[PDB]
Design an enzyme around this catalytic site. Sequence first.
Site, mmCIF file in Angstrom:
data_model
loop_
_atom_site.group_PDB
_atom_site.id
_atom_site.type_symbol
_atom_site.label_atom_id
_atom_site.label_comp_id
_atom_site.label_asym_id
_atom_site.label_seq_id
_atom_site.Cartn_x
_atom_site.Cartn_y
_atom_site.Cartn_z
ATOM 1 N N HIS C 141 0.704 -1.332 0.089
ATOM 2 C CA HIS C 141 -0.059 -0.027 0.025
ATOM 3 C C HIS C 141 0.847 1.171 0.185
ATOM 4 C CE1 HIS C 141 -2.854 3.120 0.976
ATOM 5 N NE2 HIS C 141 -2.316 3.273 2.482
ATOM 6 N N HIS C 212 -6.888 8.447 -0.927
ATOM 7 C CA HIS C 212 -6.052 7.969 -0.276
ATOM 8 C C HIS C 212 -4.699 7.032 -0.627
ATOM 9 C CE1 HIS C 212 -5.809 5.498 3.973
ATOM 10 N NE2 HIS C 212 -4.760 5.579 3.043
HETATM 11 ZN ZN LIG Z 1 -2.616 4.910 3.606
#
Ligand SMILES: [Zn+2]
Lengths: 274, 274, 274, 274
Positions: C141, C212
């Site tokens: 991520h 995000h």
């Molecule tokens: Zn994050």
Amino acid sequence: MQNITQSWFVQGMIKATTDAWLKGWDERNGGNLTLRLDDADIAPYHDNFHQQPRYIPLSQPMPLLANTPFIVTGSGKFFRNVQLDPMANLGIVKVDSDGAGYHILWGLFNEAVPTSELPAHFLSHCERIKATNGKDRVIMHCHATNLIALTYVLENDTAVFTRQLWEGSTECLVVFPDGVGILPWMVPGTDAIGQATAQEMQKHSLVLWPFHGVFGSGPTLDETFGLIDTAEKSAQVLVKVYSMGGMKQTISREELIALGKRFGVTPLASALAL
Amino acid sequence: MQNITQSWFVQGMIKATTDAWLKGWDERNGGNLTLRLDDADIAPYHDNFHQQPRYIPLSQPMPLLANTPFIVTGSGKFFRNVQLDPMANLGIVKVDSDGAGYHILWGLFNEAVPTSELPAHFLSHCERIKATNGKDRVIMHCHATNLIALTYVLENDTAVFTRQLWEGSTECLVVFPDGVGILPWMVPGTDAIGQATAQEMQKHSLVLWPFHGVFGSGPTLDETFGLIDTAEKSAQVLVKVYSMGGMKQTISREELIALGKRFGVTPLASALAL
Amino acid sequence: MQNITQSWFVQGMIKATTDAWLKGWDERNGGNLTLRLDDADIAPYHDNFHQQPRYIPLSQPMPLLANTPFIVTGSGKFFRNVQLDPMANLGIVKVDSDGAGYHILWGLFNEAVPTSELPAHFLSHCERIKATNGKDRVIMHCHATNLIALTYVLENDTAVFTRQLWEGSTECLVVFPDGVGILPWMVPGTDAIGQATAQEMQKHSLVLWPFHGVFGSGPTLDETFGLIDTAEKSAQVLVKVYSMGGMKQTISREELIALGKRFGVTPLASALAL
Amino acid sequence: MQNITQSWFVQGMIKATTDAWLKGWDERNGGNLTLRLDDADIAPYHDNFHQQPRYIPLSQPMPLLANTPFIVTGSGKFFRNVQLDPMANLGIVKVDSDGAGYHILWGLFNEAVPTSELPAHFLSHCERIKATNGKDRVIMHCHATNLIALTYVLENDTAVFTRQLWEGSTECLVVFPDGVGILPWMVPGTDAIGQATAQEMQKHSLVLWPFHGVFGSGPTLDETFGLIDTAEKSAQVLVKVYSMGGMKQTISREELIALGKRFGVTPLASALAL
Ligand SMILES: [Zn+2]
Ligand SMILES: [Zn+2]
Ligand SMILES: [Zn+2]
Ligand SMILES: [Zn+2]
Ligand SMILES: [Zn+2]
Ligand SMILES: [Zn+2]
Ligand SMILES: [Zn+2]
Ligand SMILES: [Zn+2]
């Protein structure tokens, strides 16, 4: 001996792939590079060569390339990793005595093979050798970000696209007076796209694959790299200019003409409109 | 001895060329740098000097520069490679006893020569020496991306362009209160473009070549580099602002005026409109 | 022995976190990475293990992950610092014999813990193992800038967003034929957002968290990293194209179709509109 | 002994200045950094201290800072050069027994002095100490490009600007729930601009100087740096979004509210409009 990894050509490939990775041009395995070598280059290293050199046939006979060694990036291999393990990620290949295939003499460890754009490379080598009387030695493909971006936006017309790149940095005309050829989008990693690239390499030292990347040809890794970087630098200025709403002023036709005259260069006629 | 390559000035040139290459300013051989030296700088190194120093005439007499050594980037040479082989890519030159030519004392291996913008450099050295009572020592040219981009978009008027750069970063006014001169586009690497650059160097420590690059003058490599970087940082903010549709608010005339007063600086009048 | 810090997996994590930090993707502690290991990987290092391994329960039973070691980034830890102190910023964890928790075997010095996105990671590991018959080993991520930017601008519809990314670089389709899933914005670092991510990981090797970041899954750190980089490179071209007013031409449906056929890839149907 | 240059705090300053230089934030001497130290930090190094420590008075009494050492960047000094010569470019200072001045104990070779933004720094230290019960230790100012750009474009209203930055990256709210204060443009390097910055430091850990830069406060160099980087990363996404014509969707008020509740953070009320 020094190891082959310390040789000018393995070091040159590390330097050029790494620098391109650094530019943002070579995400994943994107992009590829092959450098034509002489026998004299690789022969001092014969004793560090492969367990037994593997033969791969060519997609089509290439008699001009008979007995020619190259160093080449591997299929699926990342530009980023070349500095880390050149022998895993590069290979030294040598086309056989009648251009039907090559032996992998060094590198490409673990059954790696030469780049999947090898048809584009070798065919373009062939045309660049004839077109420059053997001076060009490099074919370089990278996903040069701004040039790719411009292909969604500029008329994909060799002469308008050339002209925009000339405008976008003064030196461009001098560096690439023959302009940049544009192909239709084609399925990559095919014989057809390599033939089409090789055909434009007859006329330009740069060829755009819209929505994909650029191919350049040069006498040396630095000069080939710098050819590209110059085209891409201009693209980058142009991206900014267009993003700011477009040109209010630019280099005029006469100025581009006075420029190619001072530098002893013959600029692509069709790009000399206005 | 230590080698000359370890000397402050060869190290300074490596540092400044590499840092400019790192900025994106110096694609291919783009950009060039010359640094005026004293005799005392190069003399401790006399014994590492050239086989026999080669003489090249000047394009025109420069009597102010009689007996002056410089270290200079080579024509065709890449900023990127300076850290790798400074002696191939730099040269130490020393103008002769009546400013008609120079001997290449060190470097420029393999018959390289000083930058093809040497007329711009040396003529601008000449004017910067008179204009700063000999304090400036550097002339630096690079293809500073955002400033080049802005030349397609901003009115190429010294006072409007200066004013925009002042606005685009608070400090700019303090760093370059004399502003930035703009030339008409000119064929580069000519006597004419060097004369014209040298003439604006009378009035500004920065001079723009539209659609090409910037020239700066400074007392040291860092200060010259940082002059440029400041102009280019502002250009970079402005590119973003214009690309977002333009300024909604900015630094006002009075604020720029209070600013030049606090910093004991006299800001270019013609750029003080509104 | 060699220290565990010299092991391929600690070195791989240093390389991937640092490279992501270098990309601009991992401001502060942003982003996280976990890599599934085998017993054989960590066992040669048993003697450099923790004072006494600390147990932390799982947010929910994960029986598929019983007895599985991972190396993982720590909560609050910066990608930038991993190269500097891997043992402070990474931890080797091993899920217990019925998937209810793990012992921290190495690293995470000073009572650090695994990433606060561990529910997303471990649940997505679980689905990627089933979906790829155990081939995927990585969940990554990062706050990939252009992809995040595009989430404010492109219809947050899996098939339109996939299609735009396919267009924005030719290779994208080949690299991610399954496309990129899009979640609704969700509060991060929750069980709910990890379940939802894990559910889309059933169908895509990439999943966007609007406003995000992106989550990718891959067989190796390089391949997972390169998956992301490819998606982000395209986003980056698209940002430029949209910022220049949009596409005038692009890769057509048929071309994307001929492309997935040549590469032996089955492209997400719903993204094949026009 | 180890030299002081090898100490955690000199190394921390090298790391933070260099990383900021690397970001593009610190053209020329732009930007400055001071770190509050304990006696215990500097005392093990007493024997590598200055020929005789020079005293400089404060612009105004600061009794809270009596007997407090700091390490600080020097006026006119470049972030880029700190890694190269920390003792030339940094100084260790210690405020005297009733906050009227400081002795320069180490560094700032050749009559350099602490940053010309020292009023901003020390006054903001004073307020951050009271506001965080002494936890903050760092004040960092840099010319963060995208945030500066946004100040020409976004309403310079603390609550709208905060809200945009919250939107532009999910984590932002969590990292800076108190938002970012905005000053009117002020002449920098003055007592007035330092008072005004210190006053907003009462309420925010970030303060914008429009058309100039950002000031952040943190418990450690990494955390202060990362505070800034987070604000700037968001600005960077926003620059791209605005440059692409603006947001089509974004994080809603309720989502920002659910977010600050999960993270145990109390978000700036006035930024919670819609
Ligand atoms: Zn994050
Ligand atoms: Zn390609
Ligand atoms: Zn390939
Ligand atoms: Zn130039
Ligand atoms: Zn040159
Ligand atoms: Zn985390
Ligand atoms: Zn400042
Ligand atoms: Zn300063």
